[PDB]
Amino acid sequence: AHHPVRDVIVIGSGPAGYTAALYAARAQLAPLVFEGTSFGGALMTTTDVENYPGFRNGITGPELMDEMREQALRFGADLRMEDVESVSLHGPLKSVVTADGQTHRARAVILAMGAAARYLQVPGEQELLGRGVSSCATCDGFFFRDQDIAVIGGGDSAMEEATFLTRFARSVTLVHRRDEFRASKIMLDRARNNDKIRFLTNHTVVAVDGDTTVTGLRVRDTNTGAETTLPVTGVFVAIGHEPRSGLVREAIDVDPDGYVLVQGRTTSTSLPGVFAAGDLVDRTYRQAVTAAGSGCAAAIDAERWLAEHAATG
Amino acid sequence: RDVIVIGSGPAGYTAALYAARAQLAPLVFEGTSFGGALMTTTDVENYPGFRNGITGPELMDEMREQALRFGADLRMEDVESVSLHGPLKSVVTADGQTHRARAVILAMGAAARYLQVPGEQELLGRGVSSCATCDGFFFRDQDIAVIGGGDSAMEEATFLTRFARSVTLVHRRDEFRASKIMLDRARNNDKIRFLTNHTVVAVDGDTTVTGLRVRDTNTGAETTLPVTGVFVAIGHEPRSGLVREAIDVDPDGYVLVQGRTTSTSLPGVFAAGDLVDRTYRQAVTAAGSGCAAAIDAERWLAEH
Ligand SMILES: Cc1cc2nc3c(=O)[nH]c(=O)nc-3n(C[C@H](O)[C@H](O)[C@H](O)COP(=O)(O)OP(=O)(O)OCC3O[C@@H](n4cnc5c(N)ncnc54)[C@H](O)[C@@H]3O)c2cc1C
Ligand SMILES: Cc1cc2nc3c(=O)[nH]c(=O)nc-3n(C[C@H](O)[C@H](O)[C@H](O)COP(=O)(O)OP(=O)(O)OCC3O[C@@H](n4cnc5c(N)ncnc54)[C@H](O)[C@@H]3O)c2cc1C
Ligand SMILES: NC(=O)c1ccc[n+]([C@@H]2O[C@H](COP(=O)([O-])OP(=O)(O)OC[C@H]3O[C@@H](n4cnc5c(N)ncnc54)[C@H](OP(=O)(O)O)[C@@H]3O)[C@@H](O)[C@H]2O)c1
Ligand SMILES: NC(=O)c1ccc[n+]([C@@H]2O[C@H](COP(=O)([O-])OP(=O)(O)OC[C@H]3O[C@@H](n4cnc5c(N)ncnc54)[C@H](OP(=O)(O)O)[C@@H]3O)[C@@H](O)[C@H]2O)c1
Ligand SMILES: [Mg+2]
Ligand SMILES: [Mg+2]
């Protein structure tokens, strides 16, 4: 057999990863994709995705992901459910190392490892993920029409999130661990003006009650005191996100919070032949359509760079 | 109202879908002639989510009907004028009625430039494509042509050699309007054959492109390239005419947007889809930017 040199390796599942895989495959770049031992993206918990254009009746998160995945496979993507520990990006013939110690190399690399939402890690929380507890108001906010809900955080996100929710919720109760707020004095100012916004300062969350649905939010420390229950039917966490740039952070330019910077209005990182899609880069709109778009854009950018770069030949 | 959306298509519809779900009560002017670039596409295979592919119109209808479901007001009529300066923006329909909003989302996209030769429009998406990243796959091992003498025609034709066994680049003049590296790369490709000083005049075939009727040979005339697929690469024309005095556009007419966002050069005015994008003209891309416009506009509206 002739063991050729691969054109593209993709790091990451999720809409950005799989769309890139789909495009690269269809462009006969024979993409090798490392899905992760724990594959899928943020959508593997979302019960009903209603704002992915094309699905008038909505689609289950995982259903959507399997289709993207199966699409990718159909055009010849090599998908592998394993993790990348190391990544050498400098030079032509880039390199990637999996958890088993095996090295896998390619001419271009598509970074699409996304970004984990920061969670409270309180007993009831992960259980009710996407059946009461969301981390995204632009996604799930609709599903809480006229309900009494909470928003957890004291930052610009928590403010923006909670303010936005007021168009659906009748009560948005903004809960926060400390007295001051690490958020802006305009976002706070806007939050304070909203008649549906109620503040709960110096209170940490202790649990999230309910079996099928959020039933209450167990608060605790009242600066000095302790224990209480906000009778809410939905809890939006707004602690921020943690982009998965650890493999790449300082071979490549990243912002202070760890998001990969990309050149101009493109997907090209600060290293030739290395490209970045999805929420690993995007910190403004964390949608699947936007992830899928950028994923596609990576694959096209990479094609062009490859074409430009074998073409001297 | 908070937001008026100008344009149907993936960018328009996704923006509408998002705005609607955000309870911004979006008014969308679809155009008297709906749909986008996809209303001609027979089989869409690289829109992520559709393992079995979907017909262009089918996909569009779903996007449309999705938008309707979350409370979009869709109107199949044309906007003739657009006043964007100030708060309380304005739009005027072909019937002379004014419709106003706080924000506006420009999503009028960009029409591919066609030859307008009798056979061509009839076989649109059944032989004649305007997009190699889209339809290139469908031409495996076929003899095809690419029409143009610019960098697109070069890029397009060079890309297609991955699938086609012959890509025959036909062009009206001796001299090529394209770059001398794109040309250079086009010349080095074994599968690339040039046809200079030749205009196209028809496209033969009923169910499929069967030949490409070539024309004037500088002095001579008439001939037939036995091709089974014709890719047009004459460029695109972005529909910025309503907006091209108020908002910043590039020389070719594409709306410039601020940084990595959808905001044009006028506060409260936003641009998505192929009206802005001139590098990847995909539906996923347009849908993405559509959505990004809605979110940008919501945040701008909320900021106040
Ligand atoms: C409840 C909910 C509802 C939502 N609703 C919508 C909606 O309606 N419409 C919409 O468009 N969006 C929606 N979203 C947002 C959407 O989930 C995200 O924007 C999307 O998941 C981003 O994908 P990504 O590819 O950028 O990264 P991710 O989704 O995180 O996927 C990237 C990944 O890469 C893998 N990975 C990372 N590093 C490695 C490594 N070193 N080795 C191997 N694998 C690795 C991980 O396993 C993960 O799968 C919703 C989200 C949630 C949580
Ligand atoms: C043959 C073909 C195959 C394709 N295949 C794929 C594919 O497989 N996968 C993929 O991802 N992409 C594909 N594409 C590309 C995709 O179709 C485009 O990116 C998409 O159509 C762009 O949509 P848009 O929102 O930019 O607006 P466009 O689609 O460019 O146009 C939308 C429209 O908006 C309306 N409009 C314009 N001006 C006004 C106005 N002033 N007032 C009211 N309405 C107005 C018009 O009615 C028009 O229909 C294909 C394109 C073609 C032609
Ligand atoms: N331009 C923008 O604003 C933009 C737009 C959209 C999204 N974003 C995203 O938003 C982030 C920006 O920061 P942010 O707005 O999220 O604020 P943040 O800086 O992340 O603030 C987090 C604060 O929330 C509180 N908190 C964290 N964990 C808690 C817990 N377990 N229990 C109780 N309280 C807890 C803490 O307050 P204390 O430490 O004070 O106790 C913590 O300091 C970025 O990561 C970005 O991804 C940014
Ligand atoms: N940068 C890229 O490589 C690339 C990538 C993606 C998208 N695009 C987009 O595609 C366009 C790039 O420009 P382009 O290379 O397509 O050229 P263009 O800028 O769109 O110009 C069109 C030219 O095509 C020529 N032409 C070729 N054949 C013709 C014919 N049969 N009849 C009439 N005119 C004919 C004409 O000039 P002559 O006949 O004198 O040559 C005409 O001026 C831009 O709109 C850009 O947004 C480009
Ligand atoms: Mg955040
Ligand atoms: Mg073009």
Report the nearest-CA residue for atom 6 of ligand 4: B279
Task: Report, as residue numbers or ranges, the catalytic residues of A.
Answer: 136, 139-140
Spatial neighbors of A60 by CB under 8 A, at least 6 apart, are A46, A47, A48, A49
Cα separation of B189 and B156, whole Å?
13
Token pair of B104, please? 């506006």
From the list B230, B233, B232, B267, the residue with the least C-alpha distance to B247 is B267
Token pair of B71, please? 């409370």
| Neighbouring-strand partners of residue B279 | none
Tokens 């400390």 found at: A178
Whether residue A245 contacts residue A259, with contact meaning beta carbons closer than 8 Å, is answered with yes
Whether residue A110 contacts residue A302, with contact meaning beta carbons closer than 8 Å, is answered with yes
Whether residue A279 contacts residue A243, with contact meaning beta carbons closer than 8 Å, is answered with yes
Name residue B149's amino acid: G
In this structure, the number of other CB atoms found within 10 A of the CB of residue B48 comes to 33
Rounded to 5 degrees, what are φ and ψ at A166?
Answer: -50, -25
- Residue A246 Cα to ligand 3 midpoint, Å, equals 20
Method: X-ray
Cα separation of A140 and A58, whole Å?
13
Question: Which residues lie at CB < 5 A from ion ligand 6?
Answer: B 152, 235-236
* Rg (alpha carbons) of chain B, rounded to whole number: 21
Contacts with A26 from chain B: Cβ below 8 Å: 45-46, 137
Cα separation of A258 and A272, whole Å?
20
CA B302 to chain CA mean position, Å: 31
From the list A1, A23, A2, the residue with the least C-alpha distance to A10 is A23
Cα dihedral A133, A137, A139, A143 sign: positive
Contact: B302, A163; criterion CB under 8 Å: yes
Token pair of B73, please? 């007001």
Name residue B303's amino acid: E
Contact: B70, A19; criterion CB under 8 Å: no
Tell me the ligand closest to A154's alpha carbon.
3
Token pair of B201, please? 């005049």
Q: Is B234 in the pocket of ligand 4 (CB under 6 A)?
A: yes
CA A178 to chain CA mean position, Å: 27
Cα separation of B249 and B156, whole Å?
25
Contact: B288, A289; criterion CB under 8 Å: yes
CA B138 to chain CA mean position, Å: 19
In this structure, the number of other CB atoms found within 10 A of the CB of residue A41 comes to 27
| Neighbouring-strand partners of residue B138 | none
In a 13 Å sphere around the CA of A131, the CA atoms on its Cβ side amount to: 12
Which one of B82, B134, B231 would you pick to mutate in the ligand 2 pocket, going by the greatest count of ligand atoms within 8 A of its CB? B134
Cα separation of A171 and A25, whole Å?
48
From the list B245, B239, B240, the residue with the least C-alpha distance to B83 is B245
Contact: B280, A297; criterion CB under 8 Å: yes
Cα separation of A80 and A34, whole Å?
5
Contacts with B14 from chain A: Cβ below 8 Å: 53, 289
Cα separation of A256 and B202, whole Å?
58
Spatial neighbors of A229 by CB under 8 A, at least 6 apart, are A209, A216, A217, A218, A219
What is the DSSP secondary structure assignment for residue B242, as one 8-state letter? T
- Residue B6 Cα to ligand 6 midpoint, Å, equals 22
Which one of A139, A142, A244, A283 would you pick to mutate in the ligand 1 pocket, going by the greatest count of ligand atoms within 8 A of its CB? A139
Q: Which residue of A has its CA nearest to B137?
A: A26
From the list A67, A14, A289, A48, the residue with the least C-alpha distance to B10 is A289
Token pair of B61, please? 């209808």
Token pair of B237, please? 């024309």
Q: Please give, rounded to a whole number of angstroms, the shortest distance from the CA of A139 to a CA of chain B.
A: 9
In this structure, the number of other CB atoms found within 10 A of the CB of residue A65 comes to 26
Q: Is B129 annotated as a binding residue?
A: no
Report the nearest-CA residue for atom 43 of ligand 2: B31
| Neighbouring-strand partners of residue B146 | B169, B231
From the list A221, A287, A297, the residue with the least C-alpha distance to A61 is A287
| Neighbouring-strand partners of residue B53 | none
Cα separation of B17 and A56, whole Å?
10
Spatial neighbors of A138 by CB under 8 A, at least 6 apart, are A51, A164, A285, A286, A287, B18, B22, B295, B298
Say what angle helices A156-165 and B283-303 make with each other, to 10 degrees: 90
In this structure, the number of other CB atoms found within 10 A of the CB of residue B150 comes to 17
Whether residue B72 contacts residue B20, with contact meaning beta carbons closer than 8 Å, is answered with yes
Resolution (Å units): 3.0
Q: Is A255 in the pocket of ligand 3 (CB under 6 A)?
A: no
What count of CB pairs under 8 Å joins A to B?
A: 132
**Domains of chain A: residue spans and CATH:** 1-117+241-313 (3.50.50.60), 118-240 (3.50.50.60)
Cα separation of A8 and A5, whole Å?
9
